[PDB]
Amino acid sequence: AEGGVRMFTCSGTDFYDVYSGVGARRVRETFDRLRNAAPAILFIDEFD
């Protein structure tokens, strides 16, 4: 808010699903969305 920037968020669960090969396209797409929507800050909970 005070930085005045769009906020994107996620979670540690939806990405660590075991459907094989899906994670690569997922992270690729979300990062490209960040890039074309930058500046922005991706908050991600339970990164571990």
């Binding site: 979670s11 669960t13 939806d14 660590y16 699903d17 075991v18």
Partner: protein
């Protein structure tokens, strides 16, 4: 493989369709058991998938 997560999905779906409701998972010791450090087991794999499906579904 993939059976436990799909069963949890089916259960929570037919539950959330009929809200308000109550679910009762007796003896969660086999599902919410802590994720170990090693052990290459397909049963361990299915436990992990069921656990995180449970987690995201109550999410």
């Amino acid at each position: 493989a993939g059976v436990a997560a799909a069963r949890v999905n089916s259960l929570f779906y037919n539950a959330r369709k009929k809200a308000p409701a109550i679910i009762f998972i007796d003896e969660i010791d086999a599902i919410g058991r802590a994720r170990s450090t090693l052990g290459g087991d397909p049963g361990s794999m299915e436990r992990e998938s069921a656990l995180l499906a449970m987690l995201v579904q109550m999410d």
